[PDB]
Short mmCIF file of C-alpha atoms and ligand atoms in Angstrom, two decimals:
data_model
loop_
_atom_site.label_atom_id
_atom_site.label_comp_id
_atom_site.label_asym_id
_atom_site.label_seq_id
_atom_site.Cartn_x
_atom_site.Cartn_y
_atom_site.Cartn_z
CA UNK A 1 1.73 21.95 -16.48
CA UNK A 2 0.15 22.34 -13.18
CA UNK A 3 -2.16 25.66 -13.63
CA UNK A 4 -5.65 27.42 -12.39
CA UNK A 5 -8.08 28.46 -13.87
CA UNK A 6 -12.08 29.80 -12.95
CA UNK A 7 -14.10 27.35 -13.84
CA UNK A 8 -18.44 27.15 -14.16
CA UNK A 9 -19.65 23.79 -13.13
CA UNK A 10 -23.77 22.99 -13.24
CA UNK A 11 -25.06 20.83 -10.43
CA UNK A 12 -28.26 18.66 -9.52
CA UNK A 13 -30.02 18.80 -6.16
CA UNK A 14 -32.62 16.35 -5.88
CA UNK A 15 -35.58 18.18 -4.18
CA UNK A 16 -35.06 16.70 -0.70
CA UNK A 17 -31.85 19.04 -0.48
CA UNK A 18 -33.75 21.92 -0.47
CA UNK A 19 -33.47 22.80 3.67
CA UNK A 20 -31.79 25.84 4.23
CA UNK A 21 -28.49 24.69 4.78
CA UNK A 22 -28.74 23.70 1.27
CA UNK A 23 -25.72 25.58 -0.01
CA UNK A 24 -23.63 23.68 2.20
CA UNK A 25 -25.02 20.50 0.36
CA UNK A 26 -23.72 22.77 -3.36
CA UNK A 27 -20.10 23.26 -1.83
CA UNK A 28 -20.36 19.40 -1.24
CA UNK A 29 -21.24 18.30 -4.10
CA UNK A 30 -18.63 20.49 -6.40
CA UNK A 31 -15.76 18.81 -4.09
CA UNK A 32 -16.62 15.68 -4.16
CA UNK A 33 -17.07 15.38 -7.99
CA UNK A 34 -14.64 18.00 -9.07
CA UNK A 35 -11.84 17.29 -6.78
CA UNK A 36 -9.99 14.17 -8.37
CA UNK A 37 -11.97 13.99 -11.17
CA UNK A 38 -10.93 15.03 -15.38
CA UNK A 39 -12.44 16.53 -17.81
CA UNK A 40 -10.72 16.45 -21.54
CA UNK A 41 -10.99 20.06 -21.80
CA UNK A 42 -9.06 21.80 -18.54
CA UNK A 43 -7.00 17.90 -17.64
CA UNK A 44 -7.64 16.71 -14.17
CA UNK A 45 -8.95 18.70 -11.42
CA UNK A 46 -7.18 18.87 -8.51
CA UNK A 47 -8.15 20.98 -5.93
CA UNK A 48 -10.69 23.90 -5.73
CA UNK A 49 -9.10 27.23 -4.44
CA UNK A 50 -11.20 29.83 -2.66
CA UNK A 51 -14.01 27.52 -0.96
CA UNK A 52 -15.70 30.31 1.56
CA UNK A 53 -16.48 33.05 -1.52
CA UNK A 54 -18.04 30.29 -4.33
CA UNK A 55 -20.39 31.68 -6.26
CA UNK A 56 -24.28 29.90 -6.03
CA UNK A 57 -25.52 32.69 -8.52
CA UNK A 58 -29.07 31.58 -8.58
CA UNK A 59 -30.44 28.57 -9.02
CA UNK A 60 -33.17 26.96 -11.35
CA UNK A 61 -35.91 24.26 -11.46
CA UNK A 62 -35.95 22.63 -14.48
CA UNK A 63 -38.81 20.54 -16.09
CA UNK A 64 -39.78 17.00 -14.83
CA UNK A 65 -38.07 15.12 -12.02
CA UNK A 66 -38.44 18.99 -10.62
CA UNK A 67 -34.02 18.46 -9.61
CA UNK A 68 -32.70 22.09 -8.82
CA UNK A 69 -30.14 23.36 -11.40
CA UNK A 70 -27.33 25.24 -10.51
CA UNK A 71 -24.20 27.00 -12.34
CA UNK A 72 -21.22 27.39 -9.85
CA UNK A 73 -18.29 29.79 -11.16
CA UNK A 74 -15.04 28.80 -8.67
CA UNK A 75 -11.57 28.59 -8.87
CA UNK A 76 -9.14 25.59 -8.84
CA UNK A 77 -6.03 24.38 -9.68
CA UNK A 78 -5.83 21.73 -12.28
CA UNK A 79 -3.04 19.84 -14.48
CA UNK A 80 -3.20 20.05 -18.47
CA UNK A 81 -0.15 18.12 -19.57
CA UNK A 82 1.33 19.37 -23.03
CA UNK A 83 2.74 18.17 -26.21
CA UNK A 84 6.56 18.91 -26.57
CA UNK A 85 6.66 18.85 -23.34
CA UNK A 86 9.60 17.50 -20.81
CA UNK A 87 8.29 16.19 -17.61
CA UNK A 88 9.93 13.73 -15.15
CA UNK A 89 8.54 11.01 -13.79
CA UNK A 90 8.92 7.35 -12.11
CA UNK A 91 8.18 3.81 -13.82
CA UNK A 92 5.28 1.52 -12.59
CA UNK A 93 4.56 -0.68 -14.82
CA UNK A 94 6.76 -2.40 -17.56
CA UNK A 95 5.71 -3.72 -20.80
CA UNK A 96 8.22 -5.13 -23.64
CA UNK A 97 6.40 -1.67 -26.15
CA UNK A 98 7.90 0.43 -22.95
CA UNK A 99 7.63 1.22 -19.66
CA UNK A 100 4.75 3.40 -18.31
CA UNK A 101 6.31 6.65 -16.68
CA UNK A 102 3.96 8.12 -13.80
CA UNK A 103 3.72 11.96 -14.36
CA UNK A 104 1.55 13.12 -10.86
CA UNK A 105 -2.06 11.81 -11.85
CA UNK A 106 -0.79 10.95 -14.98
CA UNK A 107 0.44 7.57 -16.80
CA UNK A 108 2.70 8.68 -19.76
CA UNK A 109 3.89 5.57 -21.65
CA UNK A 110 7.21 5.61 -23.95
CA UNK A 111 7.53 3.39 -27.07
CA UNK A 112 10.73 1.09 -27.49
CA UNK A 113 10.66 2.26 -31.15
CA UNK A 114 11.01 6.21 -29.17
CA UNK A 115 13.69 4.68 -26.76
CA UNK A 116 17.40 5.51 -28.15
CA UNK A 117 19.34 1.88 -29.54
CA UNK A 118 21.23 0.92 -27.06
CA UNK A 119 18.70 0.95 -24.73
CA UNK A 120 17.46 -2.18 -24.06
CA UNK A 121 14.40 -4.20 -22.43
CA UNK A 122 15.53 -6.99 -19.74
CA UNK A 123 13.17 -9.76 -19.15
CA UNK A 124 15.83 -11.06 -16.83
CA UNK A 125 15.12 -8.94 -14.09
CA UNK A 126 12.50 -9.05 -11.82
CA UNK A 127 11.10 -6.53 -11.94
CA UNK A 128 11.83 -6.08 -15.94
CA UNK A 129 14.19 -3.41 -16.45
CA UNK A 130 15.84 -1.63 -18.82
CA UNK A 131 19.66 -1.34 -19.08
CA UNK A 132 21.10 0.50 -21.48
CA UNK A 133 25.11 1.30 -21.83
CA UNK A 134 25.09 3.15 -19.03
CA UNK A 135 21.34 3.52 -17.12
CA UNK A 136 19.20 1.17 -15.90
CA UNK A 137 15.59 1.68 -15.85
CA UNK A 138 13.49 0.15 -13.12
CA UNK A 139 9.99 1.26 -11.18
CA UNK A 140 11.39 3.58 -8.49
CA UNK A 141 14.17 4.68 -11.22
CA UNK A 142 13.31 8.72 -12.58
CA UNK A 143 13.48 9.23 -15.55
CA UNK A 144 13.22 12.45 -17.47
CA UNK A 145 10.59 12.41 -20.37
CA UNK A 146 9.39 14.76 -22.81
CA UNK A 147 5.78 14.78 -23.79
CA UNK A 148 5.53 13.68 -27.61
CA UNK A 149 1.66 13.51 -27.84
CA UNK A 150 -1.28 13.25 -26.21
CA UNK A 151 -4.83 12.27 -26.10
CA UNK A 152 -7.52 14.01 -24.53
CA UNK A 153 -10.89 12.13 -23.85
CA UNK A 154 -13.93 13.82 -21.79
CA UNK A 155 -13.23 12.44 -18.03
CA UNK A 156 -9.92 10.90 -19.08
CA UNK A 157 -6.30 11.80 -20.80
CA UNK A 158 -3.41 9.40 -21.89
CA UNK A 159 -0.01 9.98 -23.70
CA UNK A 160 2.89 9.57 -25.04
CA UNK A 161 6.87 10.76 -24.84
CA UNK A 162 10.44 10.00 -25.89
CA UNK A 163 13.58 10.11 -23.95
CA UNK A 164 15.66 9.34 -27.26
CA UNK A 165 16.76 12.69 -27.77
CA UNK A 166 19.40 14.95 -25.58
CA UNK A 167 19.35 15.89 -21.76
CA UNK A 168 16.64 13.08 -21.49
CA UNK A 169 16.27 9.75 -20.11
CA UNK A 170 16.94 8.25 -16.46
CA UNK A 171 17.20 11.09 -13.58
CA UNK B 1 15.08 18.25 -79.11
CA UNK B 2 17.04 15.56 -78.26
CA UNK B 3 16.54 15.64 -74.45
CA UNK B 4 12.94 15.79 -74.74
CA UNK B 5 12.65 12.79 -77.22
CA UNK B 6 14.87 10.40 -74.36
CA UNK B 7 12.85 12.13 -71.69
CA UNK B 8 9.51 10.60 -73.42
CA UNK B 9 11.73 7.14 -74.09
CA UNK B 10 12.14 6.82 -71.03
CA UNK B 11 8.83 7.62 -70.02
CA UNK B 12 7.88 4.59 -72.27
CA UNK B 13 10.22 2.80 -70.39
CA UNK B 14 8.60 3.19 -67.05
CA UNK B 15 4.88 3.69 -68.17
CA UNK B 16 3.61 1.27 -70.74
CA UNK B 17 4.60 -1.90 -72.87
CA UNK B 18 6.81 -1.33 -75.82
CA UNK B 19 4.10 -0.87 -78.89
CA UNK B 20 3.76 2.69 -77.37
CA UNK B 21 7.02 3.26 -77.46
CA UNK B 22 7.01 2.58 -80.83
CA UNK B 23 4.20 4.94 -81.59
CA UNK B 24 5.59 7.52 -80.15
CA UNK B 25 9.07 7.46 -81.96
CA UNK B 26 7.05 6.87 -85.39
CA UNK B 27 5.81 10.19 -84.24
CA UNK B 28 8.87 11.46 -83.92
CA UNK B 29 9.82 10.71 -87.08
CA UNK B 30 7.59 12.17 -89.06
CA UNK B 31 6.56 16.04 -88.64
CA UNK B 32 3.30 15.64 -88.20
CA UNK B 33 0.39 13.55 -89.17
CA UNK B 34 -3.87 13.75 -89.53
CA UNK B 35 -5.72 10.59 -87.64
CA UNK B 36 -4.63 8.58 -90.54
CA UNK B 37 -1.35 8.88 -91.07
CA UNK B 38 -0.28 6.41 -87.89
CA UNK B 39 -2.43 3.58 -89.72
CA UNK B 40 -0.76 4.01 -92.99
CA UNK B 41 2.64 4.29 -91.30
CA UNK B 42 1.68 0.95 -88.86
CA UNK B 43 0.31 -2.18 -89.30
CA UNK B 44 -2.04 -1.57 -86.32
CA UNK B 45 -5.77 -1.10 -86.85
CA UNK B 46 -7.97 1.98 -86.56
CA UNK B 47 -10.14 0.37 -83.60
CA UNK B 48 -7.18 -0.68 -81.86
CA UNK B 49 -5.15 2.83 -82.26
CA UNK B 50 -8.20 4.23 -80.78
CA UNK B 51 -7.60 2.04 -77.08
CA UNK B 52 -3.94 3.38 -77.56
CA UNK B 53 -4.93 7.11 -78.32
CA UNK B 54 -7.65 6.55 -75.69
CA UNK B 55 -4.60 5.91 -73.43
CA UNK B 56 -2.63 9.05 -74.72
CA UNK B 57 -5.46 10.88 -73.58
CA UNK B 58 -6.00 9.53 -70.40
CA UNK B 59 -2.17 11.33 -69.82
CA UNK B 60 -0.69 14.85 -70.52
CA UNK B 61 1.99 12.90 -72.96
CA UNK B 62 1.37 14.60 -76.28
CA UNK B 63 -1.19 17.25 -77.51
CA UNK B 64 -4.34 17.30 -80.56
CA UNK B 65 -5.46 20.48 -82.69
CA UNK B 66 -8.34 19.32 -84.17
CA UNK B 67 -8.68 21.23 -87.54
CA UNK B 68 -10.85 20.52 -90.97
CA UNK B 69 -9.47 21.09 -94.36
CA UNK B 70 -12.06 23.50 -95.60
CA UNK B 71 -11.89 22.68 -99.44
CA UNK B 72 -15.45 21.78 -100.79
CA UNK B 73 -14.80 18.30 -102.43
CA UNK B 74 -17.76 16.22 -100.41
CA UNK B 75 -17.51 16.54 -96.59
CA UNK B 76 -14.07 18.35 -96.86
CA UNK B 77 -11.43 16.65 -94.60
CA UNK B 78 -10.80 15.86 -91.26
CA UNK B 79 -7.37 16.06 -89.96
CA UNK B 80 -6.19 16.12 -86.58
CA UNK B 81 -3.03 17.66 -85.56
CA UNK B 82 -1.14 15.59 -82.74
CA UNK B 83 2.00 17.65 -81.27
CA UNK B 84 3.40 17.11 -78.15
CA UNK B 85 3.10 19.46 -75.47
CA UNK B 86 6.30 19.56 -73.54
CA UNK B 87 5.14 21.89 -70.34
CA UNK B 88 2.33 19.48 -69.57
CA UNK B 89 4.42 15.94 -69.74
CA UNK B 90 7.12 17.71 -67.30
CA UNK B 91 4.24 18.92 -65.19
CA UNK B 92 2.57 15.11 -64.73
CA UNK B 93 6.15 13.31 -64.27
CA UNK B 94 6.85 15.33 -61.41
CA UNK B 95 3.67 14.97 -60.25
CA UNK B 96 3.74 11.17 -60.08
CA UNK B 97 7.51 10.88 -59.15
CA UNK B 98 6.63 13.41 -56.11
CA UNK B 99 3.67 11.51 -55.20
CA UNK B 100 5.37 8.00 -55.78
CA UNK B 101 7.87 9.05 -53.43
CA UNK B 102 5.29 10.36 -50.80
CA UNK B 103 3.68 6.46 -51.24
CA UNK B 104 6.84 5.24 -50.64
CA UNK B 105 7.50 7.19 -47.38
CA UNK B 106 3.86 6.38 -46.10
CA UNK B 107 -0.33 0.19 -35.02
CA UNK B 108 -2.33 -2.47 -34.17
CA UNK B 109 -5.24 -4.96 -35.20
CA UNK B 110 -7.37 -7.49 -33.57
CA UNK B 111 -6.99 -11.17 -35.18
CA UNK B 112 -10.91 -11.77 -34.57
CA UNK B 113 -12.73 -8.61 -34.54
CA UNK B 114 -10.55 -7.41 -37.43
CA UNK B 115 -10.63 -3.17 -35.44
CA UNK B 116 -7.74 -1.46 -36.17
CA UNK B 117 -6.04 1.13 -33.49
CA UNK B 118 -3.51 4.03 -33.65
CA UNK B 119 -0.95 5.31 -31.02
CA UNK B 120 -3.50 7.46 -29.25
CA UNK B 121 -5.25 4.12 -28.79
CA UNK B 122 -2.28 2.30 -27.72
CA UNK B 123 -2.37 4.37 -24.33
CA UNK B 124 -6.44 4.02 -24.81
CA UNK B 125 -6.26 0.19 -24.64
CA UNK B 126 -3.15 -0.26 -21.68
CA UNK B 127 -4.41 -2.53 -19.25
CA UNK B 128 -2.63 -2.59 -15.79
CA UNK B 129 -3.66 -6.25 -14.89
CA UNK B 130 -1.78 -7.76 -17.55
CA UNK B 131 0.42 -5.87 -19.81
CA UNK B 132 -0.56 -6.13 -23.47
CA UNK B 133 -2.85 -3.60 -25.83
CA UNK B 134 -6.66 -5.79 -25.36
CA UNK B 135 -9.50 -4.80 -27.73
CA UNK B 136 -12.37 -2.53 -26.89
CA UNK B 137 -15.46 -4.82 -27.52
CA UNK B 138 -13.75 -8.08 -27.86
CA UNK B 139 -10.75 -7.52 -25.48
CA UNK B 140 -8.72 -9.61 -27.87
CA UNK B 141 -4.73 -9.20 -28.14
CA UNK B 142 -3.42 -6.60 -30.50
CA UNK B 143 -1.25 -7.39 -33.30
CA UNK B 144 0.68 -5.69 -36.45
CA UNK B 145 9.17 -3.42 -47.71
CA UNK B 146 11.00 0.05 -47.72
CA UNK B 147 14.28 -1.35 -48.65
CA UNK B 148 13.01 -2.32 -52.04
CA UNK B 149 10.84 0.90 -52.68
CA UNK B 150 14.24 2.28 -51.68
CA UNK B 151 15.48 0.30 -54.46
CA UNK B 152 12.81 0.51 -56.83
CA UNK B 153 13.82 4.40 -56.35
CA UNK B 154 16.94 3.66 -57.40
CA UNK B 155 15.37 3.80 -60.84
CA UNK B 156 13.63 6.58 -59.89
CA UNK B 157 16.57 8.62 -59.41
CA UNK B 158 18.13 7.98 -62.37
CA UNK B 159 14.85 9.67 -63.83
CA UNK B 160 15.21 12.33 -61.62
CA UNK B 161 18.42 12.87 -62.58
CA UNK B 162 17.50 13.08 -66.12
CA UNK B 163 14.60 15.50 -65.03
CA UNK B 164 17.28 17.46 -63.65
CA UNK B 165 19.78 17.31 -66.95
CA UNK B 166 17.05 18.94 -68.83
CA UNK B 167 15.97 21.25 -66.73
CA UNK B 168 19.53 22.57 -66.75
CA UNK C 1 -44.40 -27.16 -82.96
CA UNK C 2 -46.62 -28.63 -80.29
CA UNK C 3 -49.92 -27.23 -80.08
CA UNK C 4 -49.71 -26.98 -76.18
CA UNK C 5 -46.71 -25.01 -76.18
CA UNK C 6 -48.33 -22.59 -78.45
CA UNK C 7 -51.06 -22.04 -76.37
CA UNK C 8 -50.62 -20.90 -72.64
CA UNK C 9 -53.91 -21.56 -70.38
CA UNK C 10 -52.85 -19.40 -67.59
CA UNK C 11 -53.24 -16.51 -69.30
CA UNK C 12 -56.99 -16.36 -69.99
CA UNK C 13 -57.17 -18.10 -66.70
CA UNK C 14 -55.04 -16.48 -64.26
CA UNK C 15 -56.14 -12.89 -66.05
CA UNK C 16 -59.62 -13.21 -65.24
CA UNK C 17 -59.12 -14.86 -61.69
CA UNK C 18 -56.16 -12.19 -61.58
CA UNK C 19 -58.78 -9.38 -62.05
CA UNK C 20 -62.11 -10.36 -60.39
CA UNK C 21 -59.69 -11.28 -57.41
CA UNK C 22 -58.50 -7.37 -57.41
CA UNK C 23 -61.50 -5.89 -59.30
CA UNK C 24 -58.87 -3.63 -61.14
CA UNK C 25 -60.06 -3.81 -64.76
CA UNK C 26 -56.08 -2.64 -66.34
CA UNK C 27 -56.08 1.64 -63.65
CA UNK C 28 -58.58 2.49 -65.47
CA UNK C 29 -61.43 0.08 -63.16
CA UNK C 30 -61.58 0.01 -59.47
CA UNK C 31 -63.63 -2.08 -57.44
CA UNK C 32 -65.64 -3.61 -59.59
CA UNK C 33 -65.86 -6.58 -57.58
CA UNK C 34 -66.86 -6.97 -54.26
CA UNK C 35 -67.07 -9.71 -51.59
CA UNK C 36 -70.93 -10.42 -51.11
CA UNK C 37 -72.05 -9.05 -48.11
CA UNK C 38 -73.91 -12.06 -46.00
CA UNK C 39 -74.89 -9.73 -42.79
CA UNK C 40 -78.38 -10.12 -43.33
CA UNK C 41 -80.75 -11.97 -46.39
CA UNK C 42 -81.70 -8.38 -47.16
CA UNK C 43 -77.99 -6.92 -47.17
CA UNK D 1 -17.03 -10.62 -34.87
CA UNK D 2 -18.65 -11.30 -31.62
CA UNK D 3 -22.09 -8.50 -31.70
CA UNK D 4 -24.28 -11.52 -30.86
CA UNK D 5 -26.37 -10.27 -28.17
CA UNK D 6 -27.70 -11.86 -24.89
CA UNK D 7 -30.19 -11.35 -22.33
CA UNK D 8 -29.28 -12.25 -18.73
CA UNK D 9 -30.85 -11.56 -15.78
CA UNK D 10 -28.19 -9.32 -13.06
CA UNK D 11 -30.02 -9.82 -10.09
CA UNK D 12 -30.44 -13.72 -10.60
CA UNK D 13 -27.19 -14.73 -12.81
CA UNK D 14 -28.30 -18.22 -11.62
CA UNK D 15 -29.05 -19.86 -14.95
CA UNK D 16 -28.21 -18.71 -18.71
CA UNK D 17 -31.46 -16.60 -19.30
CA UNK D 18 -34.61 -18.40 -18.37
CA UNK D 19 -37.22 -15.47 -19.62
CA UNK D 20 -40.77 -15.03 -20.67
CA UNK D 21 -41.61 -12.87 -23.25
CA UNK D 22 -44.89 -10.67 -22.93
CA UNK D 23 -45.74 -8.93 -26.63
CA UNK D 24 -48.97 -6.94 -25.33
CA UNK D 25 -46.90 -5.13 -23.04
CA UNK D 26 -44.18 -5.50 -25.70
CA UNK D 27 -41.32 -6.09 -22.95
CA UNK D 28 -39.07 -9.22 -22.13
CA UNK D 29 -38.89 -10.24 -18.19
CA UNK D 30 -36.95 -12.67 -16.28
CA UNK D 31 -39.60 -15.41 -15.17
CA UNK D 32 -38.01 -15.81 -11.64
CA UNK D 33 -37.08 -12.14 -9.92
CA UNK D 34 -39.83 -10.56 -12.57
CA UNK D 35 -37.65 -8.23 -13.55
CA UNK D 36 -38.20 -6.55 -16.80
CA UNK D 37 -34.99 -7.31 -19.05
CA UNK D 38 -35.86 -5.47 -22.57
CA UNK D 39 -38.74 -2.88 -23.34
CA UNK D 40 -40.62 -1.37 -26.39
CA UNK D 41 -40.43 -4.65 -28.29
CA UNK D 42 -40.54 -3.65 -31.81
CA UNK D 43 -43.07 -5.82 -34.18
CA UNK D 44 -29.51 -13.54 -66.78
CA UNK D 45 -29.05 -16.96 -67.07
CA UNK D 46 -31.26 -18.21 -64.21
CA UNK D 47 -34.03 -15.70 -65.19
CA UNK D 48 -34.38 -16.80 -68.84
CA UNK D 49 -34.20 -20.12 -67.56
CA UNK D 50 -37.50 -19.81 -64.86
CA UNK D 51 -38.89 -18.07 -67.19
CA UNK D 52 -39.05 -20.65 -69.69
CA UNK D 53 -39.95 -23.49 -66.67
CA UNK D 54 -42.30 -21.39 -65.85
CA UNK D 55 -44.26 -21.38 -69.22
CA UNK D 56 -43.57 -25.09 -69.31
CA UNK D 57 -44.84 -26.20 -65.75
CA UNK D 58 -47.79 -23.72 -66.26
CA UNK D 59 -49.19 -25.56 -70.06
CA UNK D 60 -48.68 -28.50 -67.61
CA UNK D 61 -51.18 -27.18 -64.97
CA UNK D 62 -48.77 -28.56 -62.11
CA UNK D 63 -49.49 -26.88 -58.79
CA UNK D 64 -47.02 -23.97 -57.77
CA UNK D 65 -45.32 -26.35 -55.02
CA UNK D 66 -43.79 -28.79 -57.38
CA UNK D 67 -42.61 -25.99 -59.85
CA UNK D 68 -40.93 -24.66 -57.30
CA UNK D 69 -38.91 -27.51 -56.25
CA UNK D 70 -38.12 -28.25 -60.17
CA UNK D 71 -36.78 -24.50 -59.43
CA UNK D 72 -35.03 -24.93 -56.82
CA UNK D 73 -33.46 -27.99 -57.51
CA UNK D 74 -32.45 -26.24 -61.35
CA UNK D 75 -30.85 -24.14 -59.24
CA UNK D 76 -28.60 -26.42 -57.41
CA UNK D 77 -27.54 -27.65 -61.10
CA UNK D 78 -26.97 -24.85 -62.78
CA UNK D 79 -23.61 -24.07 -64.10
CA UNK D 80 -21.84 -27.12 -62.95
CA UNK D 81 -18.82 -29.00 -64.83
CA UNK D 82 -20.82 -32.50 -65.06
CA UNK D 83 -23.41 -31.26 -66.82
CA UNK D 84 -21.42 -30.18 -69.39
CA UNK D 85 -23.95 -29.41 -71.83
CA UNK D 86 -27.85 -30.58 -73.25
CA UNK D 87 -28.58 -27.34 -74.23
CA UNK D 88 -31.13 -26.53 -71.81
CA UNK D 89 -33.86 -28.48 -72.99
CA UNK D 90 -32.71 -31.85 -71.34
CA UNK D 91 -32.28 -30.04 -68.29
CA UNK D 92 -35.74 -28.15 -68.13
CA UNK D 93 -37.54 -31.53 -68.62
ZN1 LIG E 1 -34.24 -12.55 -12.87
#
């Protein structure tokens, strides 16, 4: 699910940042690590919304190493993938547990035990693809996949889906 | 009281030897007894029923009203009263058949650092270079019955279908 | 018997070694004994 | 299962680790870059049995070293099949 959502970020200047122009240095900063980055809580960041009216509220000096704190309140646009959740995507990489469906950012792998019988790995092909009764699944193949679980880790996610059931598999 | 008494035989059946068995349909054929009356009736020891009534009491099987005979000649009398409680015995075989069957219904290991890992691991330890599931510290490969608990069940039904008889 | 099984020398021996080594007389005794103090002739 | 650790030097890499160690300052360094590599350098049976040897090497007045290789070696006997018996006084002596 591609949403957005405000979120408050803290940030570091080390004291040689501290020229006037400073804030420009602040909206720097949240890009660069925000942008492309994930956090386990709100999935990955994608892009921050709204760049000209962010928020420097007003920043602190901490104890030692005398680094300028800051808490920035912006807005952004980030994906939290779900559980039960059907989501296409297209194969990269293909191992004989399943082959790895690419969901935007994300690498959703399927388990042959969650793959329906009569589909089948092929070792045969290069690249290894499936072929079932009917579809064949290769890399640039898309294939529609429902989320079955997933696992959220600060700075990282990984999960898992099934195309076994109905109105599922290749696209 | 029919039912109950092959209900508890076959309870013997699945949960101890034979020489329980026994006891218990010795007990069935006489009314009731006081914490001798087992010893006359068998050949068994006193020391020895006490591992077996030990046992008893480790289960909900039967039941003990421990009562004195009141009549001042010396210390008076100690009898115990052992009657078997039918609500609790139904209570513990479903119990254990339930949770047998939950057993019943109940991944990946590293040969040489002996870790164990789940499916939220699995897309944890994916590795794009090769393609395999390698260990965290050691980066090591990743390695890995119900028929015959199925069968084994097949026993357990008919149990369940006695369960069932005298329920109703 | 044998008379030097009966009797064990180490424990007279090691006791009173034992105890003027630690100076615990048991603790009911506390330094009672004291390394000699060779600073000076009058110390 | 591995958890052996080693000290190696990331700048040189050259060699395995060739390293002094330096206990005043507490702190391991690399002899060749002199870089510092780790800091804050921290500073029933066979009872009855000694027992009895015990009481019997002490009536004999024999220093502690050879009653304790008599022990130790006791030890290595012990329980075995070839012994099969003597009833503890053969083995004592
Ligand atoms: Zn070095």
């Amino acid at each position: 699910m591609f949403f957005i959502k405000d979120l408050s970020l803290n940030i570091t200047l080390h004291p040689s940042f501290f020229g006037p122009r400073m804030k420009q240095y602040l909206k720097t900063k949240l890009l660069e690590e925000v942008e492309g980055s994930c956090t386990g809580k709100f999935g990955y960041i994608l892009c921050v919304l709204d760049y000209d009216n962010i928020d420097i509220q007003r920043g602190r000096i901490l104890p030692t190493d005398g680094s300028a704190e800051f808490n920035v309140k912006y807005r952004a646009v980030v994906f939290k993938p779900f559980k039960g959740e059907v989501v296409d995507g297209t194969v990269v990489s293909c191992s004989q547990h399943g082959f790895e469906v690419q969901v935007g950012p994300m690498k959703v792998f399927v388990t042959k035990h969650l793959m329906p019988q009569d589909l089948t790995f092929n070792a045969g092909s290069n690249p290894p693809s499936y072929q079932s009764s009917e579809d064949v699944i290769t890399i640039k193949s898309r294939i529609r996949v429902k989320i079955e679980g997933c696992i959220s880790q600060v700075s990282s996610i990984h999960a898992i889906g099934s195309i076994k059931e109905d109105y599922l598999g290749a696209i | 009281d029919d039912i109950v008494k092959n209900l508890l035989k076959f309870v013997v059946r699945g949960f101890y030897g034979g020489s329980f068995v026994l006891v218990l349909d010795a007990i069935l054929f006489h009314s009731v007894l006081a914490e001798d009356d087992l010893k006359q009736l068998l050949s068994i020891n006193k020391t020895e029923l006490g591992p077996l009534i030990a046992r008893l009491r480790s289960d909900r099987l039967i039941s003990i009203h421990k009562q004195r005979e009141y009549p001042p000649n010396s210390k008076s009398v100690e009898r115990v009263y052992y009657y078997v409680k039918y609500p609790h015995a139904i209570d513990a075989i479903k119990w254990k058949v339930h949770q047998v069957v939950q057993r019943l219904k109940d991944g990946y290991m590293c040969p040489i650092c002996l870790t164990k890992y789940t499916q939220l691991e699995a897309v944890q330890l994916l590795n794009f270079d090769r393609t395999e599931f390698l260990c965290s510290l050691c980066d090591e490969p990743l390695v890995e019955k119900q028929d015959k608990l199925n069968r084994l069940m097949d026993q357990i039904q008919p149990i369940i279908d006695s369960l069932k008889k005298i329920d109703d | 018997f044998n008379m030097k099984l009966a009797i064990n020398a180490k424990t007279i021996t090691s006791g009173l070694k034992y105890a003027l080594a630690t100076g615990n007389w048991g603790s009911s005794r506390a330094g009672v004994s004291q390394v000699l103090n060779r600073y000076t002739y009058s110390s | 299962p591995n958890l052996n650790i080693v000290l190696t030097c990331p700048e040189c890499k050259v060699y395995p680790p060739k390293i002094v160690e330096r206990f005043s300052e507490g702190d391991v360094v690399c002899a060749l870059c002199g870089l510092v590599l780790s800091d804050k350098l921290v500073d029933n049976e066979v009872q009855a049995a000694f027992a009895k040897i015990t009481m019997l090497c002490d009536a004999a007045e024999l220093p502690k070293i050879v009653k304790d290789c008599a022990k130790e070696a006791y030890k290595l006997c012990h329980d075995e099949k070839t012994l099969k018996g003597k009833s503890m006084e053969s083995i004592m002596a």
